[PDB]
Amino acid sequence: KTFEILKHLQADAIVLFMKVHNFHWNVKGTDFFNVHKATEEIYEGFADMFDDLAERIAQLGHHPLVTLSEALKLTRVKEETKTSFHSKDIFKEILEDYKHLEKEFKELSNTAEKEGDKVTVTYADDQLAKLQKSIWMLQAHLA
Amino acid sequence: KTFEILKHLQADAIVLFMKVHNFHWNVKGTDFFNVHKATEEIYEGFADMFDDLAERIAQLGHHPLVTLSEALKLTRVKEETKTSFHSKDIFKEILEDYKHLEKEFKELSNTAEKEGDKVTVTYADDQLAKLQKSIWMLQAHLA
Amino acid sequence: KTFEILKHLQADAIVLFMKVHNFHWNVKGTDFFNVHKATEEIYEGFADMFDDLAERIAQLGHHPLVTLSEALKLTRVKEETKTSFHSKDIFKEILEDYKHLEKEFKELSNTAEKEGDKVTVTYADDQLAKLQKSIWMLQAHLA
Amino acid sequence: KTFEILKHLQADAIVLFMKVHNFHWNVKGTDFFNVHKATEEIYEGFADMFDDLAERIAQLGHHPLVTLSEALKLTRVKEETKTSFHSKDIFKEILEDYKHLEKEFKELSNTAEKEGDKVTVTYADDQLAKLQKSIWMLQAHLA
Amino acid sequence: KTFEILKHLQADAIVLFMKVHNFHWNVKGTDFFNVHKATEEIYEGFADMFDDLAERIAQLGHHPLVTLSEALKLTRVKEETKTSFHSKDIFKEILEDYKHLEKEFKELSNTAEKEGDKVTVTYADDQLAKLQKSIWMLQAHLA
Amino acid sequence: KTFEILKHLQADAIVLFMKVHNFHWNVKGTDFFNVHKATEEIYEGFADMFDDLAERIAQLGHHPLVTLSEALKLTRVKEETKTSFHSKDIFKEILEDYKHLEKEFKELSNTAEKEGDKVTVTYADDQLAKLQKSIWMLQAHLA
Amino acid sequence: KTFEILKHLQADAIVLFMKVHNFHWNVKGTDFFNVHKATEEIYEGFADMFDDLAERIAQLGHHPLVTLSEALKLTRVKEETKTSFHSKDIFKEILEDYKHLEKEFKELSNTAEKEGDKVTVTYADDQLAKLQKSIWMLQAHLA
Amino acid sequence: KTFEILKHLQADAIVLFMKVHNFHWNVKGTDFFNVHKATEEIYEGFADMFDDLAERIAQLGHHPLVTLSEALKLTRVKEETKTSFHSKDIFKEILEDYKHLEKEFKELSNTAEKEGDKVTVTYADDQLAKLQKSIWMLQAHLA
Amino acid sequence: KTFEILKHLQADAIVLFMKVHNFHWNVKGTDFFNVHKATEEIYEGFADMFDDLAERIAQLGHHPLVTLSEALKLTRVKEETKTSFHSKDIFKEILEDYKHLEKEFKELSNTAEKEGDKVTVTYADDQLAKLQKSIWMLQAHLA
Amino acid sequence: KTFEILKHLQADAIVLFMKVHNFHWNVKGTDFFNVHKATEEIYEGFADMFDDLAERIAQLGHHPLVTLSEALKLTRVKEETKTSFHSKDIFKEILEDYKHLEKEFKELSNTAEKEGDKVTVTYADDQLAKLQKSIWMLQAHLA
Amino acid sequence: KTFEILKHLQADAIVLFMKVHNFHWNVKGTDFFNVHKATEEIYEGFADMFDDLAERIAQLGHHPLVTLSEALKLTRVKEETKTSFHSKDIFKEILEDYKHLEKEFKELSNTAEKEGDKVTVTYADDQLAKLQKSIWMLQAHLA
Amino acid sequence: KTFEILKHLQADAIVLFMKVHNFHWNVKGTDFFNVHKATEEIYEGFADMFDDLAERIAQLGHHPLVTLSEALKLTRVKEETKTSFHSKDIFKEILEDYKHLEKEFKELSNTAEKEGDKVTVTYADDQLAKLQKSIWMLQAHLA
């Protein structure tokens, strides 16, 4: 079910919104500004994805999650409790989560295709393009 | 302690970020666009307040909350589980929460003053101006 | 005399500048923002008309009114002492005043024509276009 | 045939361009501005869709319709002869037509897929995303 | 009657909106872009004139036409069924129609003057300035 | 009482809005444009202060003044009946009024502090910064 | 004849374009920048009027003047041979010429009216509004 | 293999970047500016496609070509050695190359589909939309 | 003498300002807009060069020409009395004049160098770059 | 005395303006651009603070320092004579100076409060917010 | 040596940065705003020249001055200790300093030419153009 | 011969356009974004230089190179076949090439001077300023 994949992705997006703020506040090193600026763009991206997933769910006739409690229950992202990082650590953690998201949107696209949902396919494939481009760039940060 | 008030306000801001999205997606009535547009501005405001409170905490030498789990634990805002509202309902709920926030920033300002924290006073009083202006306008929606 | 019509219109414009602020501050209902935004545009329009009429008077070799005392003496607009309205009330009151202004600019145009004042005719007819377009829209608010 | 679906959609787009202007001019109620502004955006959207469909037809080697006479002949949208509406009526009528358009673009996408026309599929699915998002919002206006 | 002239002009404007799109899609020659760009500006101009005429009619207390069926019935512009043109042909056809429109707005201005309708005179004379400037330029294209 | 100081300041702001227009229209000398431009900025500033004071009053639960009649009754600014000035005269008159306003906002800040009104203090101190900067510059015009 | 008035006005506009440059380069006094900036705007205004008059002539089926030789022959403006001025001198000279232009556009409007040329009337009356506003301001510079 | 199609397309894009500059510098005829402006947009388009193809290759885990030597080896576009053209010649040559590119992106889309590469499909179909729209317009230049 | 070359160039610039307007108004052919737009840019360029040359003369301690009479006396450009052209004719005439200007700025640069005037050299060489780029493009229009 | 604190802060601001330029020109490392860009923003900040402090002093009725000689005499910042740094060194040096400035503005605020200078308090507290936010970020660069 | 001229010019630029601020704060007269605005532009110009000279020195392989102490030692500009001026005084003082700078950049250009430093010549000649244009305008302020 | 130097520089510019893309795609390290952004600006700079050199050649009456084959034949830049770099490597390689370009533009300027080509001198010296500024900054990256 497309709804099931979307609702779980909606949970991840808000959970990641929070996580990336952690990285945003707590990066250490001469690198501070680059990471601080980049993590800002990323968390704005997740606020964006959060809203879009929710409205797609609503467009499909279902209820999006409306509480952080639901978010915590349905998320597959483990929350980060550390409060200090260097650039390398942050890039590694974001990469891991993006790889997770990439698999999920791959499934989203395949599932929506089977159910004949052209709109959700299109949304998934667009997100996939963004995640794969970022994944490539992230891997280069760590080489 | 100023830190204690900030950390609790940081929790409310993210919790309200979520709540206002609920209102944003689930408003019903010929009023849809006005509320949908206004709730968008409001939740962007809370993402803003969330970040600013967190960075003020960090500036004070302490750790801001970095998980939705901490947010849920420390918040004083009850999460909204309903998924359908008319404009009147949304405005009433936002008003209630703003009144709560207004009392908290009033305390923030008084507490930071006692501790000689001029910067946090200034931030609190600015937030207070915003909340009191909105409260007035919100009350007018309901009259 | 064209000067006589302008000087009385100048008085109305400032009096209406004030009146529309009343509507702007004191509108009640879920409608608040629409009316609050619209009344803002309207009172800026009257500040505009106020200045333009005054400078046209000056261009004609006469003295524009320079006091709120003169404004009160020369105005044909009754000031609104109520401090609470719903959208319907505000739209009705603005309509009444616009109809008054429309008759005055109709006279302005006819009088300036007789006196061979092409510039004041042009200004009057432009104001007339604006007032007639607004009048139509205002009437639709009330149907 | 993809051409057949496009040519009929081109007819609807111009017919709806006209219909939405009717709603735009003839809305009644304190709601006037919201609807007047929204219907403006919608009819600009249809002028847009009109042109794009026509040029896609031309790209496919065929002739787009070039007369209002052809438009009337090929349209599936019944023209609105009433000249007075409240917001609720307008939203209901637009919804009905959007549901019709949504089915047509669903067919467009399926048909173009069978004929191996990747470009028309992409255009259809994009239009579908727009129509489904609007349909959801429209339904919320009426609840 | 001013209303009669406006209602017929409203019909022409939408009919020309359509015609100019034909020219826009179907121009041939190394000239393609110049004509394609210029016809785009022109048809946007007619969408504009269409709306303005309709709202002027409404301001006068009457009903604007609200159907392509009425448009076809009331228009004086013959629809173009050819689907291939060179720049010279397009400029000739637009000129012919502009000359027609120019005579109509000349009448509009004279008629509205007799009926003491200063606003419609002003609108007509403005349109006349635009049409006469374009007519001059169009004639130069063909010399 | 903070309300009492605000209501009197609201009266001055509209009275000064009018006065500065007088200076704006009636400045004489090769200096015309500088003064004409500067007085424009100043009267826009007072329209601004007028609205802000009124809304602060409303936020405090009271009614702002809504008539030019109330304005005249409550103002401490004497209206200017002269209709001709050189730059030096205008700068002297504005200075006198700014000094008056400066004392009033000084009181506003002190009074709001005693009543624990942090928001009105903040507004007063901001206005004070603006008035003191202008006062300095104004004095330099006259040296 | 409207053509005769336009052709003479076209000559004045280019002659004044040149004259105002003289004032622009050769102003003396602490006033330099104000006059230098203002004369720049004025000469751009005359380049504008020059072109518009020429194209109106062309729209009327006649030939605009195309040489500085024709300009000199047909102008009523005496060229300024002095190369040094104070602000007062420049404002006096511009005023004199504007008064001349004002009479000419007054005639233009009357003549075009008799010949039933609504477009040239409209252009003349607009220019008249600009000249009368400037004349008023210019006179104030010299008082 | 999707990689094989991309690497060959990357070669064409840089080769065409160069070719279109030739057309850009060496167009002859009264047409110069139109072609010069259009070829500028086109070569910027190919710099764009060049980079995007390269980064897609990198995202797929392979190495994009990094030398003009590789470009020459892998390209299917014959380089243009003539240094003089009229508009007709340039449009014919660009059309031929666009038709080649269109077939290649058609293959790209089909191949990426078989390999389950949703992102490359999406990129190919978008490029296809652009190429087919341009092809249509190009053909019209030559009719 | 550098002054002598500048004063003659100043005369040409205003004379060409006029000439290019002729081309601007009187171009014939399907080419109208391209030439009309291009000649507009060119005459604005000459207004620019006119002013800059004049101010350079003034900077050198001399008087720039301040009359169209001086312009006619000192110019080397023959005025164009024809009032009808095709694109080819206009481009030929502009080329001829640009070649003249190019030789003059070549001399300007050489002369200013001998007199050790680094500023005038720099201005001349910049103008030369512009003229040589345009000359090349102009020649291509005519091939 | 508030004046004494301001005059010493004014000296530091210009001295730091200079120092930060040193860092701006002389940073070494792959880090060059980040530091070069950041130091640019910082020195513009000090030019800003320099001017604002000076004008506040003037507003208080005293003379700001007007010479680099006075600046050197009154500054508490030691000038940096080294001409080569890595990012770490620059961030350490800026931090040290910001900590100094932070203590000074803390004193400024306390002193102005005692003297009842609400405007200088407000300015100091704003500067304090900026310095404390930067200090936090600077410390993170060095961890 | 080019380095010697640059290092002395770098000192003057910062010294003038300071001096022009003095004029900026301490101008007296109805002229205040014109001078205050103009001196702001000028001191921003010197901050600009300061940085550019320093970076040119660095590009030449040498160390720019990095202290106000070096600036004072190497400057040829006498610092202004007066704290009160009328427009005439300020313009006279700036002129004197610009004449000094003009001679220095004249030398800079000649010296860099002898040493075959094309880049420094180009920079000097550009500065020279700016200084000579300003000098002319400044002289006109004082006539 | 100036033509010979330009034609070889044109070859280098396109070859470097390609090389810098390699660096752009294949940078490794936490530094990724800084280098990726900077290399983007650089390759756009070379596309720019490529076009400008080509058009200068054309302005000189000769044919610019129009093939990558000619580019390879005439270039002095060795192509980079490695596909992995850290920031340090990229900056070293760009520096080496910039030093080469700097010598070439030094020659360009000297050669064009001998041939009396003021325009090419000016272009060369401008490029030289850019290259020398970048060279300085590049060297600082590596220290």
G59 touches chain E (CB under 8 A): yes
Element (H, E) at F27: strand F27-28
How is residue L68 written in tokens? Answer: 């990558």
Q: K27 vs D69, F140, F141, CA distance in Å?
A: 74, 7, 9
Residue A143 to residue L28, Cβ atoms within 8 A: yes
Chains G and D touch (3+ CB pairs under 8 A): no
Distance from CA of K66 to the nearest CA of J (A): 5
Residue J41, Cβ neighbours under 10 Å: how many? 10
For residue G33, the chain K residues in CB contact (below 8 A) are 34, 38, 137
Binding-site residues of K for Fe(3+) sit at 24, 51, 55
What is the C-alpha to C-alpha distance for residues H57 and H62, in angstroms, rounded to an integer? 6
Amino acid occupying residue I136:
W
Reduced to 3 states (helix: H, G, I; strand: E, B; else coil), residue H28 is strand
Rounded to a whole number of angstroms, the distance between the first and last alpha carbons of chain D is: 38
* Option in K34, K38, K143 nearest G28 (CB): K143
Q: What subunits make at least 3 CB pairs under 8 angstroms with D?
A: A, B, C, E, H
What is the C-alpha to C-alpha distance for residues A42 and A20, in angstroms, rounded to an integer? 7
CB pairs under 8 A between E and H: 22
Chains C and A touch (3+ CB pairs under 8 A): no
E125 touches chain G (CB under 8 A): yes
SS (H, E, C) chain J: CHHHHHHHHHHHHHHHHHHHHHHHHHEECCCHHHHHHHHHHHHHHHHHHHHHHHHHHHHCCCCCCCCHHHHHHHCCCCCCCCCCEEHHHHHHHHHHHHHHHHHHHHHHHHHHHHCCCHHHHHHHHHHHHHHHHHHHHHHHHHC
Residue J100, Cβ neighbours under 10 Å: how many? 15
Rounded to a whole number of angstroms, the distance between the first and last alpha carbons of chain E is: 38
Is I63 annotated as a binding-site member? Answer: yes
What is the C-alpha to C-alpha distance for residues B109 and B112, in angstroms, rounded to an integer? 5
Closest residue on chain E to G56 (Cα): E133
What is the C-alpha to C-alpha distance for residues I51 and I65, in angstroms, rounded to an integer? 11
Residue D79 to residue E64, Cβ atoms within 8 A: no
Is C21 annotated as a binding-site member? Answer: no
Listing DSSP states for L63-91 in one string gives PPP-SHHHHHHH--SPPP----EEHHHHH
How is residue G127 written in tokens? Answer: 């220019």
SS (H, E, C) chain G: CHHHHHHHHHHHHHHHHHHHHHHHHHEECCCHHHHHHHHHHHHHHHHHHHHHHHHHHHHCCCCCCCCHHHHHHHCCCCCCCCCCEEHHHHHHHHHHHHHHHHHHHHHHHHHHHHCCCHHHHHHHHHHHHHHHHHHHHHHHHHC
Q: Which residues contact K9 (CB under 8 A, 6 or more apart)?
A: K49, K53, K101, K104, K105, K108
How is residue J61 written in tokens? Answer: 């009725």
Residue L87 to residue J30, Cβ atoms within 8 A: yes
* Beta-ladder partners of A27: A85
Strand pairing category for J27-28 and I85-86: unpaired
Can you say whether residue E61 is alpha, beta or left, with left for phi > 0 and alpha for psi between -120 and 50 degrees? left
What is the C-alpha to C-alpha distance for residues D20 and H27, in angstroms, rounded to an integer? 47
Residue to substitute from D133, D134, D135, D137, interface A, most A β-carbons within 10 A: D133
K34 touches chain L (CB under 8 A): no
Residue to substitute from K30, K33, K40, K87, interface F, most F β-carbons within 10 A: K30
Q: Which residues contact J96 (CB under 8 A, 6 or more apart)?
A: none
Residue D132 to residue A119, Cβ atoms within 8 A: yes
What is the C-alpha to C-alpha distance for residues K57 and L136, in angstroms, rounded to an integer? 10
What is the C-alpha to C-alpha distance for residues G12 and G70, in angstroms, rounded to an integer? 11
User: Could you give the residue ranges of the DSSP H alpha helices within chain F?
Assistant: 2-26, 32-59, 68-74, 87-114, 118-142
Closest residue on chain G to E106 (Cα): G118
What is the C-alpha to C-alpha distance for residues G32 and G55, in angstroms, rounded to an integer? 35
For residue C58, the chain F residues in CB contact (below 8 A) are 25-26
Can you say whether residue J79 is alpha, beta or left, with left for phi > 0 and alpha for psi between -120 and 50 degrees? beta
F123 touches chain B (CB under 8 A): yes
What is the C-alpha to C-alpha distance for residues J52 and F66, in angstroms, rounded to an integer? 38
Is J86 annotated as a binding-site member? Answer: yes
Distance from CA of B140 to the nearest CA of C (A): 5
* Beta-ladder partners of J28: J86
What is the C-alpha to C-alpha distance for residues I119 and K124, in angstroms, rounded to an integer? 10
What φ, ψ does residue A76 adopt, rounded to 5°?
-110, 0
Total number of residues shown for chain K: 143
Amino acid occupying residue J137:
M
For residue K136, the chain I residues in CB contact (below 8 A) are 55, 58-59
CATH code, domain with D46: 1.20.1260.10
* Beta-ladder partners of J86: J28
What is the C-alpha to C-alpha distance for residues G51 and I22, in angstroms, rounded to an integer? 10
What is the C-alpha to C-alpha distance for residues H108 and B28, in angstroms, rounded to an integer? 45
J38 touches chain A (CB under 8 A): yes
Chains I and G touch (3+ CB pairs under 8 A): yes
CB pairs under 8 A between H and L: 73
Element (H, E) at H80: none
Q: J55 vs J114, K23, K91, CA distance in Å?
A: 21, 12, 21
* Burial category of G89 from C-beta neighbours within 10 Å (exposed 0-12, middle 13-18, buried 19 and up): middle
What is the C-alpha to C-alpha distance for residues F66 and D17, in angstroms, rounded to an integer? 44
Q: What subunits make at least 3 CB pairs under 8 angstroms with J?
A: A, B, F, K, L
Distance from CA of E116 to the nearest CA of I (A): 37
For residue L47, the chain H residues in CB contact (below 8 A) are 47
For residue K67, the chain J residues in CB contact (below 8 A) are 18, 22, 79-81
* Option in I106, I124, I133 nearest L55 (CB): I133
For residue L87, the chain J residues in CB contact (below 8 A) are 30
Q: Which residues contact I108 (CB under 8 A, 6 or more apart)?
A: I2, I5, I6, I9, I120, I123, I124, I127
Residue to substitute from B25, B32, B68, B89, interface A, most A β-carbons within 10 A: B68
A58 touches chain D (CB under 8 A): yes
What is the C-alpha to C-alpha distance for residues G133 and B104, in angstroms, rounded to an integer? 56
D111 touches chain A (CB under 8 A): no
How is residue L81 written in tokens? Answer: 């076949």
K55 touches chain J (CB under 8 A): yes
For residue L128, the chain K residues in CB contact (below 8 A) are 118-119, 122
Strand pairing category for K85-86 and K27-28: parallel
D36 touches chain E (CB under 8 A): no
Reduced to 3 states (helix: H, G, I; strand: E, B; else coil), residue I6 is helix
What is the C-alpha to C-alpha distance for residues J141 and A32, in angstroms, rounded to an integer? 6
Contact E2, E60 (CB under 8 A): yes
Chains D and J touch (3+ CB pairs under 8 A): no
Can you say whether residue H29 is alpha, beta or left, with left for phi > 0 and alpha for psi between -120 and 50 degrees? left
Residue to substitute from E34, E42, E85, E135, interface I, most I β-carbons within 10 A: E34
Residue F61, Cβ neighbours under 10 Å: how many? 9
H137 touches chain E (CB under 8 A): yes
CB pairs under 8 A between A and D: 22
I32 touches chain E (CB under 8 A): yes
Distance from CA of H3 to the nearest CA of L (A): 16
The total of structural domains in chain F comes to 1
Range of the domain at D44: 1-143
How is residue F11 written in tokens? Answer: 């009266």
Q: At what angle do helices G32-59 and K118-142 cross, to 10 degrees?
A: 100
Residue F141 to residue K84, Cβ atoms within 8 A: no
* Burial category of H142 from C-beta neighbours within 10 Å (exposed 0-12, middle 13-18, buried 19 and up): middle
Amino acid occupying residue H51:
D
Amino acid occupying residue H17:
F
How is residue K122 written in tokens? Answer: 């180009």
Residue to substitute from C21, C23, C39, interface F, most F β-carbons within 10 A: C21
* Burial category of C104 from C-beta neighbours within 10 Å (exposed 0-12, middle 13-18, buried 19 and up): buried
Chains L and A touch (3+ CB pairs under 8 A): yes
Of D55, D46, D51, D32, the C-alpha closest to D98 is: D46
